[PDB]
Design a protein around this ligand. Structure first.
Ligand code: CHL
Ligand code: CLA
Ligand code: CLA
Ligand code: CLA
Ligand code: CLA
Ligand code: CLA
Ligand code: CLA
Ligand code: XAT
Ligand code: XAT
Ligand code: LUT
Ligand code: BCR
Lengths: 195, 39, 95, 195, 152
């Protein structure tokens, strides 16, 4: 097993699946049909966090709004969503709320009707315009690069969420700023060890 | 004598001796360290 | 908020969803777990004469078979979503 | 091999094979061979840390008393101010030990399975006994002889006893270990468990 | 403080209770000559009463409106002496008794007439097993890990 040298890997994880480093200490994927669903579910999680982590960091580096401040314009009656400074001419709460439900539910239900298991996770066609999946050897290389970047993104999202939990209101980049103030005092040590 | 040592090992006899010893021990701990509510 | 606009937009979308986007899935699942059975046999087949499926109502000349029960079902969800939006906007709740 | 109690039948699982066998397991803690295997490693690691700590506790106090250095007493050194917060120190101590001890662990579970560098994969420990990694951990290439292992274990057992003494002696006398010794040398027959 | 209580060392009803208790014993004390055996005995109870109340105050016990100590067993670290600590001691001793008890039934289970060592204790055998209890957590965990503790 690569994920923990000297540890025997589960017998159903042989390293062929992209990102199969033999990690499954609870043996969740011992039921083969669950393993395949879990493969699909992991990629879906990976691709969302890979979109979100830029979305959480890029606007904080730029104009006002850490990923939590970008959401406090709703809730309280009023509604004045601003994209890149300009208040978008439709950024009221019920407008995007319906648009989000209708658009996301439609494309998510469409995803669920695919019967083929390999197209459930690697559909291709329109979503592979540049033909990156044409080469079978190169196809599998990008499969691993996808899952590894996606697991890193999921890991970053957890940090973002857990950091927010510890320093409410702050943003992840402000956390890094506060860290670089004096790294030997502004650490997770304060969180793990109060005062 | 070996018959007597067998009898002294019978369930009731071994029990009183065991529990007598136990009671003496607990009584003396309570005479030396009385009124212990914590620990 | 215009009530007629909210109600008829909600019902419109719900009816649209049930006819064009969710129809196959709902039909597939009804076929999957079909009529209720007692001891391996439908209630009607067991003698519950009052348990006869009303094929007359279920008939429809709609291309996909969207019938009057579908209109009642998806039309009900629309009215429920509509009146949730209307009542929720009628108050001045602050979280 | 040795007898901790002349004329007393050694436990039969203590066969003269392990360095430090003096027949001492009167409570039978180690009759199961897998307990014995684990307790051997546990004695090595407790004895090695005791030797480092007891040296770090006693010897600095001796050199302050002489006057060549001036360092806090061991039970005061936590109070001092250091370039980094003590909670910061703990987090890095946890992370570094977590890596290093899981690695020691793997080799107990699966001897040899973790002797090679995972990053610079051309470097490796040579094959050896568990609890005695050698190679770069023995840069002066001392022969890990039976005598050396027996001296290692004797010194570890003595330091473990001494550490036990430092702890009990401090919570009884308030002072430090070299202080208790100097006070005892003064007039021994009156300062000897009269506290 | 915890659960609206106050430390017994600050509690007025706690102090009242000690006072009413000593006054009770002194009403009996005044019956007897000061050298007499009853006077010494009642005085011994009085000193023990005084030791007890100061001891509960110094151990950090919380008191209620009743003036009596109330134990905090939630896990709170100021009150481990009220449950966690004597409880660990109980489990250590209880497991010792049970592990020794099982050692004896196992030791005699393959004997000729096993019920004979159940009504007539083989005391020599028992003196040899009595100290297996010292390490029951390690021994019981070890029999688990290698299929020896539970039958299939
Ligand atoms: C290796 C074992 C070890 C031992 C025996 C001690 C012992 C001690 N340290 Mg220390 N430390 C140890 C590791 C470490 N300490 C520290 C950092 C500190 C600080 C900042 C302080 C101490 C203090 C203390 C004392 C207070 C006792 C206590 O906290 O209750 C023990 C309770 C349980 C075990 C439960 C005591 C002499 C305090 C002190 O100096 O007061 C006299 C103090 O302020 N230590 C770090 C860095 C994170 C360690 C890393 O392993
Ligand atoms: C994706 C990797 C990643 C990165 C680069 C950071 C980076 C940072 N975190 Mg963060 N964090 C992460 C994941 C990450 N975190 C996760 C998964 C959690 C949940 C446990 C947290 C929980 C967390 C807290 C609670 C705090 C930080 C803080 C910090 C900052 C100071 C460094 C520190 O204390 O680290 C802490 C180190 C860890 C929690 C260990 C795991 C972190 C990653 C997974 C290590 C591996 C990185 C990757 C392999 C490359 C720094 C900007 C501190 C801060 O903002 O104060 C100034 C702070 O208090 N982090
Ligand atoms: C079986 C358990 C047991 C244990 C461990 C002890 C232990 C002790 N007893 Mg004790 N004792 C016991 C049973 C026991 N006794 C019984 C059954 C009796 C009744 C006859 C006594 C009557 C007794 C007297 C009269 C005295 C002791 C004293 C002592 C202490 C000697 C110092 C010692 C701690 C002596 C002591 O501590 O002085 C106050 C003392 O004077 N014991
Ligand atoms: C399960 C119910 C229960 C519980 C939890 C307790 C618990 C206690 N009772 Mg109580 N009691 C009970 C039932 C119970 N009792 C019953 C049914 C009766 C009527 C028979 C009594 C009658 C009674 C009296 C008359 C007294 C107590 C006392 C005590 C305290 C004894 C502390 C002690 O001796 O420490 C010291 C003993 C030990 C530490 C024993 C362990 C030592 C071992 C042998 C060493 C092992 C080393 C390894 C403790 C709070 C005494 C007290 O002071 O109360 C606060 C007291 O005076 N109880
Ligand atoms: C496990 C062993 C161990 C541990 C945990 C410590 C821990 C400590 N020692 Mg120490 N010491 C040890 C063994 C140990 N010592 C031994 C074996 C010796 C040789 C006899 C010394 C000699 C020593 C001196 C001379 C001094 C310390 C000091 C210190 C303190 C901070 C030093 C530090 O981390 O600087 C950073 C360390 C590294 C970057 C590595 C800290 C309490 C210093 C202090 O403040 O006094 C208490 C100090 O002056 N120690
Ligand atoms: C009803 C269920 C329940 C259970 C199972 C526990 C269990 C525990 N509590 Mg507790 N607690 C409870 C309800 C409960 N509590 C409630 C409702 C309150 C509010 C008054 C408290 C307040 C409380 C305090 C103030 C403390 C505890 C602590 C503890 C720990 C006991 C000591 C220990 O083993 O440290 C071992 C601890 C661990 C293995 C991990 C603990 C941390 C994780 C997040 C839990 C233990 C985990 C103590 C503790 O955590 O000590 C460190 C402690 O300080 N508890
Ligand atoms: C070797 C001794 C021994 C051991 C290890 C156990 C172990 C167990 N018993 Mg059992 N039990 C025993 C003796 C023992 N019992 C005796 C003598 C009786 C008759 C009173 C019972 C009656 C009994 C009942 C009614 C129940 C249990 C239950 C249980 C289980 C849960 C714990 C419990 O409720 O304790 C309870 C313990 C008792 C009620 C009394 C036993 C305490 C005695 C004093 C210990 C044995 C002393 C023995 C003489 C030692 C001699 C050894 C010496 C020669 C070296 C656990 C498997 C419960 C269960 O099945 O849960 C799943 C349950 O419902 N037991
Ligand atoms: C990390 C988490 C998954 C972690 C699960 C792992 C650890 C499970 C590990 C194990 O199971 C294995 C593998 C094997 C078992 O044997 C053992 C265990 C240990 C059980 C998924 C998070 C998944 C997180 C993803 C899905 C979140 C996507 C969020 C996006 C939509 C956010 C968008 C926005 O953030 C922007 C962009 C801007 C903001 O202003 C507004 C909002 C809307 C907030
Ligand atoms: C780990 C070791 C101590 C290491 C301590 C070091 C790191 C201290 C580091 C620091 O000091 C510095 C340098 C600087 C200070 O400012 C701070 C601290 C942080 C304090 C003690 C182990 C101490 C180990 C103890 C003493 C082990 C004793 C167990 C023995 C007695 C068992 C005997 C028997 O078990 C047998 C063998 C078999 C059975 O049959 C019979 C019985 C009788 C049960
Ligand atoms: C491996 C390696 C490899 C390479 O190659 C080579 C080399 C380098 C050689 C190596 C290294 C090694 C080293 C590290 C060693 C260390 C050791 C020490 C630490 C010991 C201590 C050791 C320790 C010791 C014993 C301890 C002892 C102690 C004592 C008894 C004490 C006593 C005391 C008491 C109690 C108390 C009082 O009051 C005081 C006193 C009196 C004082
Ligand atoms: C033929 C045709 C057509 C037509 C159709 C239409 C136009 C439809 C309509 C329909 C509709 C329009 C429907 C409706 C429905 C409705 C319903 C079905 C409702 C329900 C309701 C409910 C259920 C309610 C409830 C409630 C109440 C009562 C109170 C309050 C609360 C609530 C809300 C819950 C078209 C042109 C398209 C196409 C071609 C063909």
């Amino acid at each position: 097993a690569d994920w923990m040298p000297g540890q025997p890997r589960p017998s159903y994880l042989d390293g062929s699946a992209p990102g199969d480093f033999g990690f499954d200490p609870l043996r969740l994927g011992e039921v083969p049909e669950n393993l395949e669903r879990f493969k699909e579910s992991e990629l879906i999680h990976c691709r969302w966090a890979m979109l979100a982590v830029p979305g959480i960091l890029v606007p904080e580096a730029l104009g006002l709004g850490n990923w939590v401040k970008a959401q406090e314009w709703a809730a309280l009656p009023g509604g004045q969503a601003t994209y890149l400074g300009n208040p978008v001419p439709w950024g009221t709460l019920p407008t995007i709320l319906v648009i989000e439900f209708l658009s996301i539910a439609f494309v998510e239900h469409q995803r669920s009707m695919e019967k083929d298991p390999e197209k459930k996770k690697y559909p291709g066609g329109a979503f592979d315009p540049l033909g990156y999946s044409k080469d079978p050897k190169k196809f599998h290389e990008y499969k691993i690069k996808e899952v590894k970047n996606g697991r890193l993104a999921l890991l970053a999202f957890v940090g973002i969420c857990v950091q927010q939990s510890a320093y409410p209101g702050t943003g992840p980049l402000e956390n890094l700023a506060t860290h670089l103030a004096d790294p030997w005092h502004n650490t997770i040590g304060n969180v793990l060890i109060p005062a | 004598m070996r018959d007597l040592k067998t009898y002294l090992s019978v369930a009731p006899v071994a029990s009183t001796l065991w529990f007598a010893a136990l009671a003496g021990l607990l009584i003396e701990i309570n005479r030396f360290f009385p009124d212990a509510l914590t620990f | 908020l215009n009530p007629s606009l909210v109600i008829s937009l909600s019902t419109g979308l719900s009816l649209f969803l049930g006819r064009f986007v969710f129809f196959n899935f709902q039909r597939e699942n009804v076929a999957k777990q079909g009529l209720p059975e007692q001891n391996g046999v439908t209630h009607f087949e067991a003698g519950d004469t009052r348990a006869k499926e009303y094929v007359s109502l279920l008939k429809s000349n709609d291309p996909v078979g969207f019938n009057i029960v579908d209109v009642l079902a998806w039309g009900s969800i629309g009215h429920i979503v509509a009146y949730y939006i209307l009542a929720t906007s009628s108050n001045g709740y602050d979280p | 091999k040795g007898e901790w109690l002349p004329g007393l039948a050694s436990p039969g699982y203590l066969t003269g094979s392990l360095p430090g066998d003096n027949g001492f397991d009167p409570l039978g803690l180690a009759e199961d061979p897998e307990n014995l295997k684990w307790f051997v490693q546990a004695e090595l690691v407790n004895g090695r840390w005791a030797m480092l700590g007891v040296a770090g506790m006693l010897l600095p106090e001796v050199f302050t008393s002489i006057g060549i250095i001036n360092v806090p007493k061991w039970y005061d050194a936590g109070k001092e101010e250091y370039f980094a917060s003590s909670s910061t120190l703990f987090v890095i101590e946890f992370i570094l030990f977590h890596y290093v001890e899981i690695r020691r662990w793997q080799d107990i579970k699966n001897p040899g399975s973790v002797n090679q560098d995972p990053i610079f994969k051309q470097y490796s420990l040579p094959a050896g006994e568990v609890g005695y990694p050698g190679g770069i951990f023995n840069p002066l290439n001392f022969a890990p002889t039976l005598e050396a292992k027996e001296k290692e274990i004797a010194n570890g057992r003595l330091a473990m006893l001494a550490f036990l003494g430092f702890i009990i002696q401090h919570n009884v006398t308030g002072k430090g270990p070299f202080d208790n010794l100097l006070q005892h040398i003064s007039d021994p027959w009156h300062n000897t468990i009269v506290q | 403080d915890i659960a609206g209580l106050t430390p017994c060392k600050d509690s007025k009803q706690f102090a009242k209770r000690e006072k009413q208790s000593i006054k009770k014993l002194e009403s009996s004390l005044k019956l007897y000559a000061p050298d007499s055996a009853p006077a010494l005995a009642i005085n011994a109870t009085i000193e023990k009463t005084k030791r007890r109340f100061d001891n509960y105050g110094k151990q950090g016990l919380l008191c209620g409106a009743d003036g009596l100590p109330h134990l905090i067993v939630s896990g709170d670290q100021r009150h481990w002496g009220e449950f966690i600590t004597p409880g660990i001691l109980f489990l250590y001793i209880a497991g010792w008794i049970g592990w020794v008890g099982r050692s004896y039934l196992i030791a005699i289970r393959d004997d000729k007439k096993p019920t004979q060592k159940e009504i007539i204790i083989d005391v020599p055998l028992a003196t040899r097993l009595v100290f297996r209890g010292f390490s029951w957590p390690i021994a019981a965990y070890r029999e688990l890990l290698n299929g020896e503790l539970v039958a299939k």
